[PDB]
Amino acid sequence: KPXCXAXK
Amino acid sequence: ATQGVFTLPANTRFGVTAFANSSGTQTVNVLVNNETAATFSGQSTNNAVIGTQVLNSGSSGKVQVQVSVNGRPSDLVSAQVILTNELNFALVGSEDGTDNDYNDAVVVINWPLG
Amino acid sequence: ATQGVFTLPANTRFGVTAFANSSGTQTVNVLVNNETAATFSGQSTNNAVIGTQVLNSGSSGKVQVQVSVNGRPSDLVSAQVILTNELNFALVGSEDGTDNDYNDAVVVINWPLG
Amino acid sequence: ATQGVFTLPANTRFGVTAFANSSGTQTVNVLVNNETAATFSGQSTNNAVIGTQVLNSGSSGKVQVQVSVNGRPSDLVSAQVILTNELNFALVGSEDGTDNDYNDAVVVINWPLG
Amino acid sequence: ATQGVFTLPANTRFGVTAFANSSGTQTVNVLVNNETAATFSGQSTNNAVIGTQVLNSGSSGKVQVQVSVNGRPSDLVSAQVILTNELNFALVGSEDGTDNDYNDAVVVINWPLG
Ligand SMILES: *C(=O)C[C@@H]1O[C@@H](C)[C@@H](O)[C@@H](O)[C@@H]1O
Ligand SMILES: *C(=O)C[C@@H]1O[C@@H](C)[C@@H](O)[C@@H](O)[C@@H]1O
Ligand SMILES: *C(=O)C[C@@H]1O[C@@H](C)[C@@H](O)[C@@H](O)[C@@H]1O
Ligand SMILES: *C(=O)C[C@@H]1O[C@@H](C)[C@@H](O)[C@@H](O)[C@@H]1O
Ligand SMILES: [Ca+2]
Ligand SMILES: [Ca+2]
Ligand SMILES: [Ca+2]
Ligand SMILES: [Ca+2]
Ligand SMILES: [Ca+2]
Ligand SMILES: [Ca+2]
Ligand SMILES: [Ca+2]
Ligand SMILES: [Ca+2]
Secondary structure, rough: OOOOOOOO | OOOEEEEOOOEEEEEEEEEEEOOOEEEEEEEEEEEEEEEEOOOOOEEEEEEEEEEOOOOOOOEEEEEEOOOOEOEEEEEEEEEEEOOOEEEEEOOOOOOOOOOOOOEEEEEOOO | OOOEEEEEEOOOEEEEEEEEEEEEEEEEEEEEEEEEEEEEEEEEEEEEEEEEEEEOOOOOOOEEEEEOOOOOOOEEEEEEEEOOOHHHHHHHHEEOOOOOOOOOOOEEEEEEOO | OOOEEEEEOOOOOEEEEEEEOOOOOOOEEEEEEEEEEEEEEEOOOOOEEEEEEEEEOOOOOOOEEEEOOOOOEEEEHHHHHEEEEOOEEEEEEEEEEOOOOOEEEEEEEEEOOO | OOOEEOOOOOEEEEEEEEEEEEEEEEEEEEOOEEEEEEEEEEEEEEEEEEEEEEOOOOOOOOOEHHHHOOEEEEEOEEEEEEEEEEEEEEEEEOOOOOOOEEEEEEEEEEOOOO
């Protein structure tokens, strides 16, 4: 987060 | 009120198709006679068809759509519409968050087939 | 009455998905502002998806669905349903023959996306 | 496609209500299993409830709505919608002229009652 | 999801009509931009019309239906349907009890008028 798809 | 439950005519083939519009991965389960008959999962913000299948309503006709995101049930909205007294659509929207667009998984059931 | 014509909000993406349930090869044309925006052709008696696409309602918002089989226009039925004042479905059935199942091509338009 | 014909569950009470929005005097006939069950008439450009009645769908459940103006059948549009898998509305609009507002007589059928 | 809330075209006349199917006296409030614009009250187990009126959606277009029985709000189910891209119905059912028939007050909003 960000740049690797991390989140929801 | 209960949403996402529909009574179909018995022993009738129907189509079920799910679309995704969310950052969260959608899981759609389709239950016929209280048994899971189809499951689709996927993530899209562009209305991908995360699954489509043909099922049989069986002796009960009871069809239920459930939507969850990583195990958390989404809030559902639903209705059934009949055109020219023959062509049936059962429609489901779902909300996995707070913006209330209700499109995060969209499920359409249609019958008759063939 | 005219069928298969829907006024969408302008400049809004929408999904269009077509299913086939007939012996005949179905051709589904989707017009936006009176110009062809998508065409799908295929044949199935098992509700196969013959096309699915994301389109834009454009500056006009006018969307029209036409269906033909072997060059002959099918008779259409349609309606729009809105759930929780937000989630829109524009629904089309079509008949290419005499049995009046109106499922020969079924077209589902949904918005909003995202 | 045929419009204004609905299959209700057999032997079920239902409401039928008609509204007028036209300079032309509307006449609405409701047929249950092909027998005339109700006739309403009036003339309003402000949505007057020209008739409301409780009927029973009878042995076959077939309900048909017809609309005419001074003997001229109007063009009909219709659909049925079901909320929470239980609350039913059968909806009719009609057009007696050229403006295609389809509100000249509007008929709503609702069930269950009680 | 929120139910009984509808966004109408701004500054547009609409009809609203309520029917009762319950032992409890129904109070139907129709709000325009959160201000009570009409109130109907009555009791029937036979689908009697308890009120009908012509209103205007006003500058905001926001219309809401609320139903209560002796100060207790009822749960609502609702949807909007559009026929021939012109004729609009906003439909509400409500439940004051435990049987989940959702007909205890039924409210029909229709537009355009005239
Ligand atoms: C998570 O961020 C919310 C989620 O995904 C968004 C892109 C949007 O589709 C929203 O409606 C959905 O609930
Ligand atoms: C027959 O060819 C007519 C045609 O194909 C059938 C298999 C059935 O789908 C029917 O509805 C369709 O009009
Ligand atoms: C004239 O008779 C046409 C007729 O009455 C108008 C006032 C308007 O309601 C129109 O829709 C209707 O067809
Ligand atoms: C109270 O008795 C319940 C109430 O009135 C009944 C006659 C029936 O219409 C029921 O649906 C409603 O909730
Ligand atoms: Ca959402
Ligand atoms: Ca979304
Ligand atoms: Ca056919
Ligand atoms: Ca067919
Ligand atoms: Ca007219
Ligand atoms: Ca009119
Ligand atoms: Ca009740
Ligand atoms: Ca009741």
